Amino acid sequence: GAAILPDLGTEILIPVCAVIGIAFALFQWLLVSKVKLSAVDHNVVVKCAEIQNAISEGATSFLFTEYKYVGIFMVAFAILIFLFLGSVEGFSTSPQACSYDKTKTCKPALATAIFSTVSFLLGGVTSLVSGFLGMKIATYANARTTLEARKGVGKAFITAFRSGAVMGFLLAANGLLVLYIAINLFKIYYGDDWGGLFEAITGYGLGGSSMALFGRVGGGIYTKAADVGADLVGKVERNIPEDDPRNPAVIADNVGDNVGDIAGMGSDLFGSYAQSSCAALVVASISSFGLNHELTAMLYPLIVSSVGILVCLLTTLFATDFFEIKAVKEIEPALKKQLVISTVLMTIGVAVVSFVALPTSFTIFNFGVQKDVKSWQLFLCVAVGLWAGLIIGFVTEYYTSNAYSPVQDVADSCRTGAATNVIFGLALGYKSVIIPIFAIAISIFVSFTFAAMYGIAVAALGMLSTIATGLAIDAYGPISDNAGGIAEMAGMSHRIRERTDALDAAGNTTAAIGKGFAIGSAALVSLALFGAFVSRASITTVDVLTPKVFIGLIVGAMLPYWFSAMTMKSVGSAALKMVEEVRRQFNTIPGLMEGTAKPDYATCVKISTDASIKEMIPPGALVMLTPLVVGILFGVETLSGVLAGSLVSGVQIAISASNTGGAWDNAKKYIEAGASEHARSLGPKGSDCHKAAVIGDTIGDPLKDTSGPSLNILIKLMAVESLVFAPFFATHGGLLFKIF
């Protein structure tokens, strides 16, 4: 059944909304350019601009180096996709029976091996463009946020948030436009074979998350080596302020906010967006929508994202035009309003899209059977994902903001030293998982029940339907974080650093919230892909109580720990070398501590550049080799176990790591600000409580910026990778069981 909105309306609506989001982001970049500064007050403006240039050059330099390796890996792995998928029907040029309906004839499997390779490289390139653009705006707006901090918090907040929105709307409108364009290009070849079209398209998400795994790990290693080294020697050993220009690791630290927290994060979320859209597409592909070639209903996920951009645009105005921040206590509530407003507005949006872009009745593929589904049931699938996200944001704020007891109790535990600070921090993180898991389970139950794997996929997209806003609040953070580091390197007034610090602490909470959305959506989308994988691999039942599935389940559950071991050990080893370097400079360069001599920044940049590029590779290998190794040697049943186990296991450590690290940071920020008497009782900066907080903060650095947030990528990447290679695994895999 056709919908109210005709195919031509949809063909127009989607890219119109994208260009709108692009226009809007370009516009926000313009308003941010209204803040003038050059390296030619005035003496302070010149210094800020010199510091920005140092950071901007350091950031661009690292991404270029990083993307070189990753681009090469991108090219190599694309050959593997062509070869393995092409080998399914021996590289035949002949058409064959449809995988989904043996009464019909489909395009040759080799064409699909080729179009998978193309969309993969599309996804890889879009992923790199995402993180790179985000870096460009972030390294542009940081000093602009510092300069506007001379006029109050509100003025600096806007600059930071407008700039976060630039990244938000650019990433979200570009990822949509490319997908839409790819789908229409692909359709030219595939014609009536939508099954093959969208099976090819799923390479897009595989491309996105592949180039994101390396950018999150590599970026995260770079940034945390510097962070730990700068803060330990600077603040704990030498009693100098954070981000002090004497500290040789400060440039690498602040560069690191852009190459990890911004660039890697942008790629990470692009992967999430792309996989969730593609997952929905691949199931609709072989449900009534794709079989009846109903284009509008087929592109329902892209229509939801389209409305999401408009909703997020109106939402953004509330924090950019309609309201101003007068007290620092208004920052976190302002950012949270963004989530609440977008969630409420988008519920209405999805209601409308569900009403105009869907027939009231259709069928959804359900493990070999066309299942009857109503459009109001699909509305609820998108909606549970959307609201689960908001719930996750709220619980995450509660456990990571210093406006509430959990983080204040952690700061408070500093009176008895670093050991109690850490025990309390760990326990907080563990505790934090409870509600998010419950929210995820409710989303799974509701959406699985109504619409099977498609429902779960659109629940994932629901949670990410507000991604422009989500990215905006998140990106706002590292921009504020740089703004404070620049203020201190520029030797500005203490009132400036206090303002940026308030903006920064809100960004800490905000970045934890972003991790929650990433982990929540990854859980949902991976589950949906898992289901699609099982179908595509022609498995009758994934029975937990079979030797093959169970070994996969327990081994898959171990993988997130293995991955965490590597990345933790890497940061630890790199930070250890950074500390030794910072100490060397302080102890051998005369006048450095005195303020007479310049530190050698480039040496610290090198330590974390060398460590990141080298050490990003094994965890990257572990994630990408696991589907291939298990699928080839052990078979699709065992890989099924690996996927379920790594999902339910990886999710727990991801959440606890991110929240623990976030809480330790904000506990530290609490002490540093001294905005209440309790906070003031743990101070001043330099006290034993403050230093204990800093210890916990630096332990949490790799937890929340390297291992923790990369875990969502590990889970969803393996899931999509498994689906893509399912025909190959089902045919040529299971080797060890065929031999013995």
Residue 508 lies near Mg ion (rule: CB under 5 A): yes
631 binds a second copy (CB under 8 A): no
User: Of all helices (H) and strands (E), which one includes residue 565?
Assistant: helix 547-588
| 231 belongs to an annotated ligand binding site | yes
Question: With the CA atoms of 258, 264, 270 and 274 taken in that order, what torsion angle do they form, in degrees rounded to the nearest 10?
Answer: 170
In 68-139, beta strands by DSSP E:
96-98, 101-106
Binding of residue 501 to Mg ion (CB under 5 A):
no
| 564 is an interface residue for a second copy by CB under 8 A | yes
409 labelled binding-site residue:
no
481 is in an annotated binding site: yes
Contact region for a second copy (CB under 8 A) — 5-13, 41-49, 569-577, 727-735?
Answer: 569-577
Identify the three-state secondary structure at position 548.
helix
SS3 track for 657-668: HHHHHHHHHHHH
192 is annotated as contributing to ligand binding: no
> Least separation, in Å, of the C-beta of 673 and Mg ion?
13
Choice from 98, 427, 593, 633 touching a second copy (CB under 8 A)? 427
Does 382 engage in binding with a second copy (CB under 8 A)?
no
Residue 317: Cβ-neighbour burial (10 angstroms; 0-12, 13-18, 19+): exposed
The neighbouring-strand residues paired with 366 are: 369
Q: Which is nearer to a second copy, 299 or 440 (CB)?
A: 440
Binding part of the chain for Mg ion, among 302-310, 360-368, 504-512, 615-623 by CB under 5 A, reads: 504-512
Q: Which of 16, 72, 352, 558 binds a second copy (CB under 8 A)?
A: 558
What angle separates helix 636-673 from helix 708-724, to the nearest 10 degrees?
Answer: 160
Among 26, 317, 419, 602, binds a second copy (CB under 8 A): 419
Q: Three-state SS for 246?
A: coil
CA 354 to each of CA 197, 305, 379, 482, 637: distance values in angstroms, whole numbers, following the listed order:
24, 12, 6, 42, 36
Contact between 252 and a second copy by CB under 8 A: the answer reads: no
Omega cis (within 30) before 560? no
Q: Does 718 bind a second copy (CB under 8 A)?
A: no
Least Å distance, CB 413 to a second copy, is 6
Select from 266, 619, 635, 645 the one that contacts a second copy (CB under 8 A): 645
CA distance 288 to 378: 14
Per DSSP, the three-state class of 398 is: helix
Cα separation values, 182 from 75, 117, 122, Å? 19, 12, 8
Report the alpha-carbon distance of residue 469 to residue 319 in Å, rounded. 11
Residue selected from 193, 330, 412, 481 as contacting Mg ion according to rule CB under 5 A: 481
Q: Considering only residues 53, 449, 493, 538, which one is a binding residue for a second copy as defined by CB under 8 A?
A: 449
Query: Does 7 count as an annotated binding residue?
Result: no
Out of K ion, a second copy, Mg ion, none, what residue 257 binds, judged by CB under 5 to 8 A for its kind, is: Mg ion
Nearer to K ion, 375 or 707 (CB): 707
Binding site for K ion (CB under 5 A): 477, 507-508, 511
**Residue choice 170, 230, 407, 579 for contact with a second copy (CB under 8 A):** 579
- Residue 184 labeled ligand binder: no
Distance (Å, whole) CA 564 – CA 618: 11
Among K ion, Mg ion, a second copy, none, what does residue 553 contact (CB within 5–8 Å per kind)? Answer: a second copy
* Rounded least distance, CB 700 to K ion, Å: 11
**Residue 502 identity:** A
Binding mask 196-235 for a second copy (x = CB under 8 A): --------------------------------x---x---
Tell me which of Mg ion, a second copy, K ion, none is bound by residue 477, counting a contact when its beta carbon lies within the kind-specific cut-off of 5 to 8 angstroms.
K ion
Q: Say how far apart CA 609 and CA 598 lie, in whole Å.
A: 21
Q: Are 234 and 247 in contact (CB under 8 A)?
A: yes
Q: Is 527 in the site for a second copy (CB under 8 A)?
A: yes
Is-contact 713 719, C-beta < 8 A? no
Identify which of residues 183 and 479 has a Cβ nearer to K ion in the complex.
479
The residue range among 221-229, 380-388, 437-445, 717-725 that interacts with Mg ion, by the rule CB under 5 A, is 221-229
Site for Mg ion in 631-670 (CB under 5 A): 665
- Report which secondary-structure segment, H or E, holds 653: helix 636-673
Residues 232-271 that bind Mg ion (CB under 5 A): 257
Q: Of the two residues 232 and 284, which places its CB atom closer to Mg ion in the complex? A: 232
Can you tell me which of 9, 108, 152, 572 binds a second copy, judged by CB under 8 A? 572
Q: 588: exposed, middle or buried (C-beta count within 10 Å: 0-12, 13-18, 19+)?
A: exposed
- Nearest distance in Å: CB 279, a second copy: 15
Q: How far is the CB of 507 from K ion (least distance, A)?
A: 4
**Three-state DSSP state, 281:** helix
Q: Would the CA dihedral through 399, 404, 406, 410 be positive or negative?
A: positive
Beta strands 369-374 and 361-366 are: antiparallel
715 DSSP 8-state letter = H
Q: Which does 280 bind (CB under 5 to 8 A by kind): Mg ion, a second copy, K ion, none?
A: none
665 binds, among a second copy, Mg ion, K ion, none (CB under 5 to 8 A by kind): Mg ion
Q: Which residues, 6+ apart, have CB-to-CB distance to 710 below 8 Å?
A: 213, 216, 217, 220, 268, 563, 567, 619
Does residue 347 touch a second copy according to CB under 8 A? Answer: no
**Residue 508, annotated as binding a ligand:** yes
**Applying CB under 5 A, which residues contact Mg ion?**
227, 231, 257, 481, 508, 665, 701
Annotated binding site: 224, 227, 231, 257, 481, 508, 665, 701, 704
Annotated binding site for substrate: 224, 704
